[PDB]
Symmetry: C3
Subunit: 223 residues, 3 copies
């Protein structure tokens, strides 16, 4: 079942990528850069999840299955999602690449701490987990603080859209570390199959859902 | 022999890099960025192939993983060089350029995974790599060539020449891979080794000689 | 002792990062990018050295390889060179080609170091030598074309660039010297001796350099 679920996921990623490509052909004032980002996210995730479906992107460690392909996915997909969110805030105004790369750095660090934590045992695991959570809190502070102020500097209509997609992504963000801690990688309260379904369903909303909402909102700003 | 061949290769890469540096001192209207790219490609490949010559860049079928370490950097830089050639004298399209870099990096990764795989799984990864290559070719002779044409007859003529040069070499690599030990195993290991010594000399050094000379000639 | 030393180091990095953040709040004409770089260096190094303190960022090869050092340097050292390059270009046109030239040389340098540490006999010193050649080219650029960029940006800027260039160059030569003398090389210096050198040097490079660098640029501020 775990294999079939990942095959299905990869197919939905492919469909998502194709949809964003078709949208890119009639861009409606959205720069090609934002369509490229929207396409890379699902395609990369799709490839990583295909490796799990083929039984390659996981191994046995500490007597538990480590789905290391998820970290290979996130280390690329999650910084790109933040870039998408940051460019949305900056839409119709001057770019702040310093702030954007601040978010990219925090996010990449976050995913790494996750991988190291999953390879770790006892107190050491939760030291790395904790550092990852601290990174996430700082990302959230930026998202609803200085990055939202950039959105507001670009007018009521843009700011309204940014706030919507900021809440969408932020809601999904907090789910991942919550599921991680509850699941076999952490306290082990949640069954392996339960975790697998969570990390199949969440990513469909993040890797495809977010960009549908994001791109449509920006396209609607077009006359 | 395999060791000696790789030593020789690395020395040719060094000579190539030195030639591009000398050219960079009298640039003839070519931006320093295009000389830097031309220098990094051979130097990086040289270092990777030196690891094979020293018997480090392989594990034992025998997997020459040092080739993937090479290509994951050298091949995206070659595509960047080709993209900047198309855009020479006009506005840059960094979105298209990074589109090609992304496709190429994915391509080389699929190759590495395929080499570590067995049976149907190997050819699923290989196939994904081929699909990436087809999309790169479509871009090269489609939208990227249109950018070249927008930059005048002389530039377009040069771009088309280097596009065909690189495209010819591109298709050779996955063909040799499939035929060789990593794939169907029809071609002998020594034959594959020579192919992945000779091809790269034309790609890592040859391409930039043709590319840079063609662009320098546009100064006159 | 080696574990405790690394814990202490990581704490000093954290303090350094916080200091640069506070400086960033009252920037005094220094762009946010240079504060971001100053913060990432110590935080990344701190995290890498924490992995050694927890006994994760090293393994046996008979002899002990502190591979977390290379994970640190491959990110921290190119960022230091970027900081130095942006200092030269302060108040003037940027040369990102030269900047990325230095990044490329530096990344190659650190890789040769790692490969050398994994190597034995003649092979080790071939890799080391290639790393030293990279360093020589970095020094030539630093006191050659990059210094000429500094000079083009006025007396006061050039004077500051020269001072931080000499500061960093002095530290640069120390690393490959300590490497060669220590267990990774000739093995003249004891393991504990090397560990202390690669704890003290980095405090001057990862925190010291940015203190001198940022203060010098902030002093140039009018009002
Ligand atoms: C190792 C891990 C590294 C992963 C990093 C990759 C993700 C980074 C993405 C940054 C994208 C920023 C592009 C800015 C677009 C500017 C524009 O649209 O004009
Ligand atoms: C792009 C995403 C890549 C996925 C990583 C796949 C790694 C597979 C390791 C080989 C496993 C095996 O065949 O035993
Ligand atoms: C965890 C390691 C990841 C580190 C990668 C990012 C490091 C940050 C480095 C440089 C910041 C780049 C800022 C670009 C400035 C452009 C000007 C602007 O628009 O603000
Ligand atoms: C973590 C939850 C998000 C906190 C948001 C704080 C806003 C910061 C600000 O307004 O500058
Ligand atoms: C909403 C949360 C969905 C999952 C809750 C059930 C957990 C099952 C388990 O313990 O494995
Ligand atoms: C597919 C998975 C997630 C769905 C996301 C939202 C559905 C599309 C809404 C489009 C819109 O808001 O205009
Ligand atoms: C610079 C490019 C070099 C990359 C390849 C280096 C490979 C080193 C592997 C050493 C392992 C061993 O000694 O067995
Ligand atoms: C993975 C590593 C990939 C490294 C290769 C990528 C480099 C692309 C360089 C693009 C530079 C374009 C700008 C040139 C210019 O403006 O003159
Ligand atoms: C890995 C790469 C994934 C995609 C990343 C985005 C980079 C896009 C660069 C945007 C440059 C805008 C300026 C231009 O189009 O000329
Ligand atoms: C190998 C075969 C693959 C295709 C080669 C190039 C396909 C045609 C390029 C696009 C043509 C165009 O858009 O004008
Ligand atoms: C040039 C000479 C060709 C030598 C023979 C080629 C062998 C290919 C099949 C193994
Ligand atoms: C940030 C840098 C991280 C250092 C890497 C941590 C080492 C991996 C864990 C190895 C182990 O548990 O044996
Ligand atoms: C790692 C490989 C480095 C090669 C990368 C290419 C250089 C790109 C720099 C772009 C320069 C923009 C214009 C300038 O300021 O010179
Ligand atoms: C991973 C990236 C590795 C990059 C390749 C390693 C070696 C790179 C060296 C190329 C840089 C040399 C440039 C020297 C000339 C600079 C100038 O023109 O002033
Ligand atoms: C040009 C400069 C490049 C070479 C620089 C340093 C060489 C140092 C290596 C000598 C160590 C040999 C010791 C040994 O083999 O026992
Ligand atoms: C061996 C040690 C070499 C290190 C120092 C080199 C000093 C370079 C002085 C400036 C030359 C650069 C230039 O003017 O082009
Ligand atoms: C990790 C996978 C990366 C794939 C990148 C997706 C590129 C798709 C093609 C881009 C469209 C450009 C066409 C313009 C005309
Ligand atoms: C496992 C034992 C670790 C004890 C030290 C923890 C220090 C954490 C600092 C952050
Ligand atoms: C990943 C660990 C970070 C350690 C602390 C770094 C320094 C403080 C950063 C604070 C960032 C806050 C930005 C939003 C201000 C409103
Ligand atoms: C206007 C002040 C911004 C505060 C926003 C609150 C933080 C959002 C919570 C994220 C989790 C969902
Ligand atoms: C006018 C044509 C000049 C061609 C010079 C070729 C230089 C080759 C350098 C080494 C390549 C191996
Ligand atoms: C059993 C052998 C199967 C080999 C599969 C090779 C085909 C891969 C796709 C080629 C694209 C043209
Ligand atoms: C050597 C491989 C060449 C592939 C490209 C051939 C088709 C190009 C079509 C261009 C249309 C004008
Ligand atoms: C076309 C690229 C060069 C091809 C070289 C082929 C050499 C094959 C030599 C085989 C010798 C016996 C193993
Ligand atoms: C693996 C070696 C197979 C022979 C070469 C196949 C065609 C590549 C171009 C010459
Ligand atoms: C607005 C200030 C942003 C501060 C973020 C600092 C980035 C640190 C990256 C983490 C690396 C460890
Ligand atoms: C085995 C530990 C791996 C940790 C990953 C560190 C990040 C990758 C290397 C630096 C970029
Ligand atoms: C192998 C690891 C790759 C190293 C890359 C680390 C990042 C260093 C690049 C610095 C770029 C910042 C300069 C931006 C210019 C500001 C305007
Ligand atoms: C002005 C365009 C800047 C190009 C960025 C350089 C790409 C970094 C290579 C990794
Ligand atoms: C890392 C090994 C590099 C070998 C040589 C590369 C080609 C020559 C580079 C010369 C750089 C000189 C820059 C300073 C100019 C004054
Ligand atoms: C046996 C202990 C010796 C430790 C010596 C440490 C020297 C530090 C000097 C830094 C430069
Ligand atoms: C850890 C070394 C710090 C050196 C800073 C020097 C004092 C500031 C000079 C201005």
């Amino acid at each position: 079942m775990i294999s079939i679920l990942h095959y299905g996921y990869s197919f939905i990623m492919l469909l998502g990528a194709l949809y964003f490509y078709l949208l890119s052909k009639d861009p409606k004032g959205v720069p090609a850069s934002e369509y490229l980002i929207a396409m890379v996210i699902p395609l990369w995730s799709g490839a990583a999840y295909l490796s799990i479906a083929l039984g390659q992107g996981l191994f046995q460690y500490d007597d538990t299955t480590i789905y290391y392909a998820r970290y290979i996915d996130w280390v690329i997909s999650t910084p790109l999602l933040l870039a998408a969110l940051a460019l949305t805030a900056m839409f119709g105004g001057k770019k702040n690449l310093t702030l954007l790369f601040s978010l990219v750095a925090l996010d990449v660090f976050m995913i790494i701490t996750g991988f190291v934590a999953d390879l770790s045992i006892g107190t050491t695991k939760y030291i790395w987990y904790s550092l990852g959570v601290i990174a996430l809190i700082i990302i959230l502070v930026i998202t609803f603080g200085p990055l939202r102020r950039i959105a507001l500097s670009n007018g009521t209509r843009l700011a309204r859209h940014y706030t919507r997609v900021a809440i969408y992504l932020s809601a999904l963000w907090v789910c991942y570390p919550t599921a991680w801690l509850l699941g076999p990688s952490g306290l082990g309260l949640a069954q392996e199959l339960t975790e697998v379904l969570v990390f199949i369903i969440l990513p469909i909303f993040s890797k495809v859902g977010f960009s549908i909402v994001d791109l449509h909102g920006l396209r609607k700003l077009h006359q």
